[PDB]
Amino acid sequence: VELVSGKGATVTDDQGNVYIDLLAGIAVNALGHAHPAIIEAVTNQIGQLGHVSNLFASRPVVEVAEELIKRFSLDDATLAAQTRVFFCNSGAEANEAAFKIARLTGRSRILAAVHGFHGRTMGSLALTGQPDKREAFLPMPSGVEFYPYGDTDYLRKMVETNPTDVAAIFLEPIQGETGVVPAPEGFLKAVRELCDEYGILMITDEVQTGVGRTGDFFAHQHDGVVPDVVTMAKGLGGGLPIGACLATGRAAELMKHGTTFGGNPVACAAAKAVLSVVDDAFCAEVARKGELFKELLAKVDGVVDVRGRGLMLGVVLERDVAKQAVLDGFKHGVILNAPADNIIRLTPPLVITDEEIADAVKAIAETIA
Amino acid sequence: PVELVSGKGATVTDDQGNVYIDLLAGIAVNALGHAHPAIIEAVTNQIGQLGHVSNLFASRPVVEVAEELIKRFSLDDATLAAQTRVFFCNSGAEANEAAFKIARLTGRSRILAAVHGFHGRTMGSLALTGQPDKREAFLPMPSGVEFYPYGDTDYLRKMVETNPTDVAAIFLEPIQGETGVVPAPEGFLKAVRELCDEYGILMITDEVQTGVGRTGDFFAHQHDGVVPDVVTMAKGLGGGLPIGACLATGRAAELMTGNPVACAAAKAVLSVVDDAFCAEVARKGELFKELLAKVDGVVDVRGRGLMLGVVLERDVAKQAVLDGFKHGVILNAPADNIIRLTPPLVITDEEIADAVKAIAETIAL
């Protein structure tokens, strides 16, 4: 049903009802709606330069790139210097660039997590662990096999059946779909040694978990590993169409590809406004708000656990009623999500106030009744 | 290369301070040029009300644009408009991948696309791109695709007739842009519509480069009075903002069963691009073709409206793109004797004249 205007963690339908948004358009509105830094950034750019081809440079494109490199290589100027970024317009378009780097390795096998989601373009659909979403459009481009998320023992044996024909391993550091399933303890570190031994590219999809959403800038940094390649999008746009493929070392030298709106100046002017807000301390504020959700919900009847970090959270019910809670959620002034019958998912704008967190835990607690 | 920093109409300026006549419009995306007031207003107005809204909710700019595109495609056909529907995305590659999936959903394995065609660099959209050096590095591709010489009706029919009931889709650009500007020959689109109609095949027009009035008609395919099952469009719809779309009518629409700010910019361009605007684009089209005829180096000027390929006596296009800077022009060399012209549709007649005088002086040796 219809939507017209919003502010912070608030948005309002045609009829005039204000809602606490805990979905943020499926995790893209990281600064909420109509945020001053983004309004300045966009109004300022659209008034000067619209779109340039990748034949030409443009500042905001260059400046966002520099910045993601900074955020990625954590006060290491050597990692920084063998890193590069490719800009796209979605996370689908971003992962496709990732699938292409894995084709440029010369190896045929790409391995992806079982409930993973990377987008619905042919190559990014080839990576999505959900086979229902694949059935209708077979053939898929070949090479992908799937592994249970967080099972180092299976993945090791899976790799070692034909190890040097493994181009890439795709993982999300926190699975967004089917629930909020965070990389278990020791997992990305494990994948990092597995890839090191065999010449494989380690690729972390941060389309949903990127830009502070986790508490760290990049959810993968919570595990102190350094992937070869990071895909990102929603959250980076602050409400505008963007994606990016970041690559370090051999993966950077391999990339051939090129999108028309790659390096969209207005898309990137927004990207800059987002980054100038989401600094380390904003990210620390994300971790905190996350624990406040956990803490207040822990006390709520019918809520059994809350899993995730920062503002990507899986509220686990005990009554298979999440689908319903959504519907009844609206009448109590909250926009919720249900990636299962068990689980309500919260991905609110990272600028949510404790007040709004607290009302939102009220709204949710009532519906369960 | 060069850092561009601000533009208006048919001009851009670099940080060096150099001012150019943009005849490339960022590969035919900046239909209304840079800093068009109508887009500035739309984009400013929308950023400030709503940033992004998920497909799970409804937003006005999208349905406003969906309904306006259907009207410009249905050319006054109430019944066509009720049959047709549009899916929004962020790129033309993404738009052509939605058509590949529609092609997939027929049940048939064969998808026929034009040699020299370019549908984008995403796996599926690259599987449709009839320039092989773009695919070799990323084989295997999504299977299904075969290629015909562009506008060879005799060879298409034979190709279909090798296995007609397994052809899902025929991809086709109303005017090829890559490697040169070749428009569909007389009655080509006509033949493909007829050949598709028996054998139950989907006729799919990629108008990602030929859309929004650049060829003199709001859709280039409407110039040959054909109604395809699927039209993909992008660059141009959003002023410079990223957008794509996939129109489908009939069986194609039944098989398929950021945005607000790019649709906000889309609304403004459609607001600006009238039947009357497209007419002006047709005419500036002719003007170029007349003025350019007088220059020495030019042999021939192919293409309709403001999608034109300047064919030269000498194989000099690539050296003219380089020299074309100091004379204050931005050109592009799809072949060694071809220079593409896709300037903003807003280019004035004085601006054109100066642009031909610039190209002429550049092709001096």
Curated annotation (Swiss-Prot), chain A:
May also have succinyldiaminopimelate aminotransferase activity, thus carrying out the corresponding step in lysine biosynthesis. It comes from Corynebacterium glutamicum (strain ATCC 13032 / DSM 20300 / JCM 1318 / BCRC 11384 / CCUG 27702 / LMG 3730 / NBRC 12168 / NCIMB 10025 / NRRL B-2784 / 534). The keyword Amino-acid biosynthesis applies. Binds 1 pyridoxal phosphate per subunit. Keywords: Amino-acid biosynthesis, Aminotransferase, Arginine biosynthesis, Cytoplasm, Pyridoxal phosphate, Transferase. Homodimer. It is an enzyme of class 2 (transferase). This is Acetylornithine aminotransferase. N(2)-acetyl-L-ornithine binds at residues 120, 259. The modification N6-(pyridoxal phosphate)lysine is found at residue 234. Belongs to the class-III pyridoxal-phosphate-dependent aminotransferase family. ArgD subfamily. Its main location: cytoplasm. Pyridoxal 5'-phosphate binds at residues 91-92, 117, 205-208, 260. Its cofactor is pyridoxal 5'-phosphate. One of its GO terms (cellular component) is cytoplasm. Pathway: Amino-acid biosynthesis; L-arginine biosynthesis; N(2)-acetyl-L-ornithine from L-glutamate: step 4/4. It is found in: Cytoplasm. It catalyses: N(2)-acetyl-L-ornithine + 2-oxoglutarate = N-acetyl-L-glutamate 5-semialdehyde + L-glutamate. The keyword Transferase applies. Its EC number is 2.6.1.11. Gene3D superfamilies: Aspartate Aminotransferase, domain 1, Type I PLP-dependent aspartate aminotransferase-like (Major domain). GO terms for molecular function: identical protein binding; N2-acetyl-L-ornithine:2-oxoglutarate 5-aminotransferase activity; pyridoxal phosphate binding.
